[PDB]
């Protein structure tokens, strides 16, 4: 009837998302024109010429390199309905003091649909990034999508497990120093590492050691770490502070499944990583006739809006792309299974 | 019929179908009615 | 040594397929003429017809 109760905007309901991988490591992105896209990793090793004087001429130089692998596909396919018959009712948006036509409301719900599709794109791409810097092996499988296995080339020294007879749990919470193990694991890191990302619970038993107490561990301790955490806000990334020559990172990012939540990290794991570890956001080609019509097969993403004829006029929203998140060198990280 | 070409020699037609799998057809249609006037004008000698 | 995009490959497939369909039309077209001036009779019979 006559109500005239001014009700403003409602909630937003964004659960959690902080990549920290597709925003820090994979800064390289290359579309595909061929399925067989190659990436080489030269295992260079040159010694010196210790004693040779310009009278005792001897050995000549030797070239180096020749290791390369390819991994084709990548993919995603988030289509959604337009719901033409529900555009009449008002959203939680579109305040009752100011309503509008369902046609522009259709535009708004299309914006919502594409935004949610890109949300799914991020949530799936981040799982590929998790596989990449979590094992050095990546398995893209599902229904209507055959499994695809990518052994990125990770060495088993990069897949250390705390599992043993002392791991951390039955050590001394007061006097034991875990630094020794930290340097032991950073030894076979294939370069200097400076980020040691913890799990939300993996850091709980880590700080249980009192050798963590004397570390700086200040909310203002670093320069790159603080700005990375700030631009990665969402209360899923917690840069604890500095551990001396390395920094304490605790990553608690999550994604929604079909309807349920899941933490991108397991309970007790840690990674030996370098700030300049370069990775790939490389993309494949669209396997759609429409894309080939304008030759937009090679692209990062691929939006599409279309409508079917007949008695039920049904519009739809589509995105096609082929995410193939990869890394230049898997060995730059060491996936230590904490225990 | 929509283009008033009900009578023609041949008929090409290219068209893409929508849906989750996208794919397009190229099509040829025609109505050959090859005929000769007078049958007795030729004698088909089956050789042997 | 010189590849292309699958898009121009799709164009090549389209042109080739058009050529094949034109050839099939030209070939099947002579069937009726062969029947006509080979017997004075002809049979326009085949599946989907």
UniProtKB/Swiss-Prot annotation, chain B:
It comes from the Viruses. It is found in: Virion; Host cytoplasm. Transmembrane segments: none annotated. Assembles to form an icosahedral capsid with a T=7 symmetry. The icosahedral capsid is about 60 nm in diameter and composed of 415 major capsid proteins. The assembly is primed by the interaction between capsid assembly protease and portal dodecamer, and major capsid proteins assemble cooperatively to form the procapsid with the help of capsid scaffolding protein. Major capsid protein forms hexons and pentons of the icosahedron. Viral genomic DNA is packaged into the procapsid through the portal vertex. Belongs to the lambda phage major capsid protein family. Homomultimer. Interacts with FI protein. This is Major capsid protein. It comes from Escherichia phage lambda. The gene is E. The chain holds residues 294 to 341 of 341 of the full protein.
